Structures are given as C-alpha cells and as structure tokens.
Coordinates of C-alpha atoms in Angstrom, one line a residue:
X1 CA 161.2 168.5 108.3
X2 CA 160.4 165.1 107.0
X3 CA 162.7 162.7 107.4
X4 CA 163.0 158.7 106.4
X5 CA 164.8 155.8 107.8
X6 CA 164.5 152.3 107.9
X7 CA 165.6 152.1 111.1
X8 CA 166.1 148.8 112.6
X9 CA 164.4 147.2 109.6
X10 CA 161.7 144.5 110.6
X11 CA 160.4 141.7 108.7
X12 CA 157.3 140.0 107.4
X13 CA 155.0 138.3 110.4
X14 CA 154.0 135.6 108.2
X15 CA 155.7 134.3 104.8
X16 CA 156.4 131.0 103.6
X17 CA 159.9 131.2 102.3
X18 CA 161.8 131.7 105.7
X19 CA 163.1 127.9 107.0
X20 CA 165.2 127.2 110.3
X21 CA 168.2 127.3 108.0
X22 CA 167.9 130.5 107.0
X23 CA 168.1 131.5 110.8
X24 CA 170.8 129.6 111.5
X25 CA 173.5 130.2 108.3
X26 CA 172.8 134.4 109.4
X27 CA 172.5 133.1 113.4
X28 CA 176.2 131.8 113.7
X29 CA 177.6 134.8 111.2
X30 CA 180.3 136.9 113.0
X31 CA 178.3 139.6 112.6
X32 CA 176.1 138.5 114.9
X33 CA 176.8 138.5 118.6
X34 CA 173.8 136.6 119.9
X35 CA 170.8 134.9 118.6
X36 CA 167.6 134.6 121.5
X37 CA 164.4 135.1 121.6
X38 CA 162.4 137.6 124.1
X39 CA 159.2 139.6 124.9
X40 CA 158.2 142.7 125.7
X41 CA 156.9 143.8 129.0
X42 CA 157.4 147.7 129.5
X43 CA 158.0 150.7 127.1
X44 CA 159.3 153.6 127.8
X45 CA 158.5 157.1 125.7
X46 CA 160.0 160.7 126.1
X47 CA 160.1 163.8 124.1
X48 CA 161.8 162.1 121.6
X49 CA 164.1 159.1 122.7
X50 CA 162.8 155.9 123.7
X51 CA 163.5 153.0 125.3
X52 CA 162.3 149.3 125.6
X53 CA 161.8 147.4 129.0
X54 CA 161.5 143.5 127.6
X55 CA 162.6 140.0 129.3
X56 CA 164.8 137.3 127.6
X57 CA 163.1 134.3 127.1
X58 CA 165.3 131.7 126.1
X59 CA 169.2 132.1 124.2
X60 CA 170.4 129.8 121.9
X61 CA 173.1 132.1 121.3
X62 CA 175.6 133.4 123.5
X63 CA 175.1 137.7 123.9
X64 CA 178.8 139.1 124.1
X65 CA 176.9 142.5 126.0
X66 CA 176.3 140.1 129.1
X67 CA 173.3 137.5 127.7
X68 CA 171.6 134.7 130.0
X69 CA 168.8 133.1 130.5
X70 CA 166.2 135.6 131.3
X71 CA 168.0 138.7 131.5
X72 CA 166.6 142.3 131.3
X73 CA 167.6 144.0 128.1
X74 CA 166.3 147.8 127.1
X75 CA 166.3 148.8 123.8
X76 CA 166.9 152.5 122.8
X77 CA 166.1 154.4 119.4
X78 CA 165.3 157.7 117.9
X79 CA 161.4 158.4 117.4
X80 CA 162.6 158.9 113.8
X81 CA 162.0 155.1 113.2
X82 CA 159.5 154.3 110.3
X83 CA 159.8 151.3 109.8
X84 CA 160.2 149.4 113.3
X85 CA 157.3 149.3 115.7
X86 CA 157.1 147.0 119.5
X87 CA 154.1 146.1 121.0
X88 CA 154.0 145.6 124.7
X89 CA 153.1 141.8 125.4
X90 CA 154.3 140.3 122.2
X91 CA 157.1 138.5 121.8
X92 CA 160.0 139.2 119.3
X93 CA 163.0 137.0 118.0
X94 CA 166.5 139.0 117.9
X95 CA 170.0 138.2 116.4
X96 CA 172.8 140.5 115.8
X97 CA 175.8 141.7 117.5
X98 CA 176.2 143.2 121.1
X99 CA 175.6 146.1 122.5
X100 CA 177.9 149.3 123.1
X101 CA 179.0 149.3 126.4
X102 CA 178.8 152.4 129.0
X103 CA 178.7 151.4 132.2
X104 CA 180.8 153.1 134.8
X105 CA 178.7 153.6 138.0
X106 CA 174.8 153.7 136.9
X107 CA 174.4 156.4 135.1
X108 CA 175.5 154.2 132.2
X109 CA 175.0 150.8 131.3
X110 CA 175.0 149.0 128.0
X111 CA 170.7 150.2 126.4
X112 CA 170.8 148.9 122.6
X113 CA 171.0 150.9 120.1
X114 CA 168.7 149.3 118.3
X115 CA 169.6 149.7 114.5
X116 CA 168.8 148.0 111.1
X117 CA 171.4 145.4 111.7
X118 CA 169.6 143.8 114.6
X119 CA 167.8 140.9 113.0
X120 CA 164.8 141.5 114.7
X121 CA 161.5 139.1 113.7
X122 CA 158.2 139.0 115.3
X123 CA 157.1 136.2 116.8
X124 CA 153.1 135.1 117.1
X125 CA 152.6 134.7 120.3
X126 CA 150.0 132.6 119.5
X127 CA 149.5 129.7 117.0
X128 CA 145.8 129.2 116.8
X129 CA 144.1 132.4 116.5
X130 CA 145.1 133.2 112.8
X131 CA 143.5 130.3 111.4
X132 CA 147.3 130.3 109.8
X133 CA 149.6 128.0 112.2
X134 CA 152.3 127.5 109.1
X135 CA 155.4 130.0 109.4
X136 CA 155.6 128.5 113.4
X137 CA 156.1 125.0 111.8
X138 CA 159.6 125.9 110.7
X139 CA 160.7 128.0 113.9
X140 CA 159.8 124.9 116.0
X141 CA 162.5 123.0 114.2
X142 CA 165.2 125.7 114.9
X143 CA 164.4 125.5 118.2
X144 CA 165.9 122.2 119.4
X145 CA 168.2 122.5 115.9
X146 CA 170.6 125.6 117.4
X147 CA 170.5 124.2 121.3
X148 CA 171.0 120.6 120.4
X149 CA 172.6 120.3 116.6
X150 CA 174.4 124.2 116.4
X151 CA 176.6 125.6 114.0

C-alpha cells in the first residue's frame, strides 16, 4: 500500500534564480485567482484528513473565494502528501486560483483543497539567522512592485 504524489508541490527555500518577475508574469496568469502572502497559526490532524488554521497577512492579489486583508483561510489535504509539509509559525507565500465553494449553512464553507497547482513558496520568516539574507532581496522588490506598479 505505498503510494506517491506530489501533492501540492512546494519549492526551494532558498535559490538564486527566482526574481520578483518571475512571481509576477505566473501572479497575474488567469490561472491564478489570487496572489497573497500568509502564516500559519493552527493545524489541524485526524485519522487521515487534515486541515490548516493560518491568517492572511497581506494580498496583493485579489482571492475570488472571498480574500481580504487578514482573513482566515483553512487548508485541507489528504495525509497522502509527500511532498508538501506546513510548519506552525512560519509564514508561506500562496498564488493560485480560488477555492471550491460549499457553503450552505455551516456545515460547509469553502476549506482549500490544497493541490499542486497552488503556488505555494516558503517564506523565511527571518532574514538574519541563516547567515544567507539573499533570496529576500528579490521578494522585497515584488512587494511594493504588485501593490504599487501591477500587471
């Protein structure tokens, strides 16, 4: 009973090679729906569905599954993910389309469904501890670039 997915595929946590264009020219695609940046607080963990309790920081894009400033958003996924890992208190960039949408009375709502499509980055959450600082150099200038400049 082994089984392999990629699941919602991550990416490198530090690689020169990655500039604020490169999150912008993928950021405005129609693929994706939104484009912000948040953090994990909570985590949830059953027998073998899961779920993710984390804040929105800041959006620079728009979420067509209800996104604004500081929102509460919960990821869901199978345990069968190899390949995607959160950690509770970093932070974690995101860009991909919305979410499905189940809400009827509160039993349902919208929950993620967190797949390989949702651009998902991690985010040091500090900048002097890796003796590295280089990779946040880039991400600073896509900061004011997509609130101020845009596609």
């Amino acid at each position: 009973g082994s089984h392999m997915a990629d699941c919602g595929q991550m990416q490198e946590e530090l690689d020169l090679t990655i500039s604020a264009e490169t999150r912008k020219q993928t950021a405005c695609k129609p693929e994706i729906a939104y484009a912000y940046k948040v953090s994990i607080t909570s985590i949830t963990v059953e027998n073998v569905f899961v779920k993710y309790k984390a804040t929105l920081l800041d959006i620079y894009k728009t979420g067509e599954a209800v996104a604004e400033k500081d929102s509460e958003i919960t990821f869901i996924k199978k345990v069968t993910c190899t390949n995607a890992e959160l950690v509770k208190g970093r932070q974690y960039l995101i860009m991909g389309k919305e979410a499905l949408q189940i809400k009827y009375n509160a039993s349902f709502r919208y929950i993620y469904p967190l797949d390989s499509l949702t651009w998902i980055e991690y985010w040091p959450r500090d900048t002097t501890c890796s003796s590295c600082q280089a990779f946040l150099a880039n991400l600073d200038e896509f900061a004011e670039d997509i609130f101020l400049n845009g596609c």
